């Protein structure tokens, strides 16, 4: 769905502020203030390859960066989707205690 019908590669680029509190970064200094993360989806290739300041990396590096930015995708608090909205709709006190 993301890939344009006909085009081989679909590209998203996202730029964030950088601070000297996150490790395992490529090409980017701690004093630098720019983190550029690029995701490309193509039909022919089936692998998890991301880009950090336009440098190819495995998804593990970007995942551990996301972990070190105190932001989480699986957790429902940081990200809310339709299924997650439905799950919050019928929410028990035990789930509140768990969170």
């Amino acid at each position: 769905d993301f890939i344009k019908n006909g085009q081989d590669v679909s590209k998203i680029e996202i730029t964030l502020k950088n601070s000297p509190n996150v490790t395992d970064i490529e090409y980017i200094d701690a004093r630098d203030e720019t983190i550029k993360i690029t995701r490309i989806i193509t039909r022919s290739k089936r692998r998890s390859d991301y880009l950090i300041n336009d440098y190819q990396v495995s998804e593990s590096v970007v995942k551990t960066l996301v972990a070190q930015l105190n932001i989480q995708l699986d957790n429902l608090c940081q990200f809310l989707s339709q299924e997650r909205v439905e799950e919050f709709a019928r929410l028990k006190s035990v789930k509140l205690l768990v969170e």
């Binding site: 085009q7 590209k11 680029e13 996202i14 730029t15 601070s19 203030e33 930015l69």
Partner: peptide, 26 residues
Amino acid sequence: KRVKIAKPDLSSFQPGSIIKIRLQDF
């Protein structure tokens, strides 16, 4: 003079925020 877009200076923006997003071939 020639029109210049606002400078995406990340220092002014709060840490962890996003200034410019590029969407290609969607």
